[PDB]
Amino acid sequence: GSSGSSGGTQLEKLMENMRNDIASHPPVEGSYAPRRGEFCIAKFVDGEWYRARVEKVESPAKIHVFYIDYGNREVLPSTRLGTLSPAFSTRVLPAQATEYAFAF
């Protein structure tokens, strides 16, 4: 936590709340099934979870997704994908992704 002259970025706020329950109670690798057109959390090479929308599901090992937080695409397995909580879901914060408008 931060007290005194604090302040962050919209995304940093939501992500900050999720990263917590996500880093303390990480999802089960290979539990959530990514479906074409479904929102979920993806694990970044830096073991950092981020909001993304399944673009194309190839195989349990290959899942085309797009980070709706930055605006990038990465083919990750169904292991790095998990159930995106409604509390941290974009439903509260708008996708800061750049290539989001084109994502879908």
Curated annotation (Swiss-Prot):
Source domain of life: Eukaryota
Tissue-wise expression: Ubiquitously expressed.
Subcellular localization: Cytoplasm; Nucleus; Melanosome
In-chain residues carrying the UniProt-annotated modification Phosphothreonine: 83
PTM (free text): Phosphorylated by PIM1 in vitro.
Residue(s) carrying Phosphoserine: 85, 89
Domain Tudor, first and last residues per copy: 33-91
Assembly and oligomerization: Forms a ternary complex with STAT6 and POLR2A. Associates with the RNA-induced silencing complex (RISC). Interacts with the RISC components AGO2, FMR1 and TNRC6A. Interacts with GTF2E1 and GTF2E2. Interacts with PIM1. Interacts with STAT5. Interacts with SYT11 (via C2 2 domain); the interaction with SYT11 is direct. (Microbial infection) Interacts with EAV NSP1. Binds to acidic transactivation domain of EBNA2. Interacts with SARS-CoV-2 NSP9.
Role, per record: Endonuclease that mediates miRNA decay of both protein-free and AGO2-loaded miRNAs. As part of its function in miRNA decay, regulates mRNAs involved in G1-to-S phase transition. Functions as a bridging factor between STAT6 and the basal transcription factor. Plays a role in PIM1 regulation of MYB activity. Functions as a transcriptional coactivator for STAT5. (Microbial infection) Functions as a transcriptional coactivator for the Epstein-Barr virus nuclear antigen 2 (EBNA2).
Name assigned to this protein: Staphylococcal nuclease domain-containing protein 1
Organism, scientific name: Homo sapiens
Residues of the full protein shown: 704 to 800 of 910
